Amino acid sequence: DRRRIPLKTPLTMRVHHPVSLKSRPVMGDHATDVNGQVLLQLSTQTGSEVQGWLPGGHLYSDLLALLHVYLGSRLDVRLQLCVERSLLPDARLSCRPAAGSPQLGRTAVMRTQAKARVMTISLGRYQRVQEHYQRKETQENGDYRW
């Protein structure tokens, strides 16, 4: 499954310390990654299961709880659900957010004006290590000459 990876530095031209083509460089904005993710696509035949799989549902939570151990840090998993439109809720506003509230970029499908086909919605992504920044460079290191 393809993911885009931000670069630390852009690809530039230099004189003293030029880039060798042995590094297989790409333009400086983003690189591809097709060895870090897999795609897990789900499909159900009833509203009960759908609600369980939607964010905030008990099946969504349980699956992540299991992936936590089964896959661990090996790979990330992208989750999506393919079900008939008739099993999805009509996006509605609320003054207060909730676990079962529709999300802008995942499930917030607008009501249809009485124009069912299969709709693909997102569920989320499994990832254990967030790769945040707390490096604290270094003060010292293992330095035995041996």
Binding site: P6, K8, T9, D29, H30, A91, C95, R96, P97, L104, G105, A108, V109, M110, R111, T112, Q113, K115, H132, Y133
Partner: protein
Amino acid sequence: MKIYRPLWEDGAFLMPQQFQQQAAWDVHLADSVARMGLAHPWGVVAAEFDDSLLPLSRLNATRLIVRFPDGTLIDTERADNLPPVCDLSTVSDRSLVDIVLALPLLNANGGNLDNGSESERPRRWKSERVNVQELAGHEQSEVAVLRHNLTLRMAHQENAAWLTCPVTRLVRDAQGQWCRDPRFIPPLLTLSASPSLMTELAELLHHLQARRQRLMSMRDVSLFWLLNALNSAEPVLKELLDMPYRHPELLYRELARLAGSLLTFSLEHNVDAVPAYHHETPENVFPPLLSLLNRLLEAS
């Protein structure tokens, strides 16, 4: 930077892109309108600093209202945050330092939101969660609100990644302490943004009126020409200064016309003495224009 105006059909998914692109278009339209009448629809509206800690090398902004060259409006009074305090300790060696307000450039390829990580390119947006009151009802809740990554930077240091607009100049005083330059003018969007200019303009009007009244009393076509010019300009210049909340371009043109006419009879001044308008460097526009006008009025 293409703008992809969204389409809404019978039924569809809502997407972040629809909202982001729609907002971009609406900003574009507002900018387009401004540009119909004004060549330089950007600059400082207001800028205020707390000089209490300036003796201790700290420049602490208290209010900033600046319209940037690319249609982005920053207003720390109505809908944004103030920048971090600038430490002047690193420029102690210099007798003069210019300070600009910097706003990181938008990345067409995304990654604009600051997620707390470090990178070569400064991030433009920050996410702050605040309690927002619903207008219709009586409930309030936490909403993610966009804030800008504003910062004050030294004018002389590399600022390639930022869009910048001057806000203040600091100089060293007799005591070796930092103080604000008594006569600094940033790119102005409104006249009220720079009290120094307002003061000089007020003085001009005073002298103009005095000259007019004296000449009117004392009543050769030179007499009438100078008097006519004063009577014609005054009714307009007055209104502009009474309500000093408009773009300098309007004022410049009126002052330029006055200088133009006065120079007709002067035999010691250069007809090309009137400076061109420069938005970025107004210090080379108004201060010399006003000085010229004062001399011309005195030379009756």
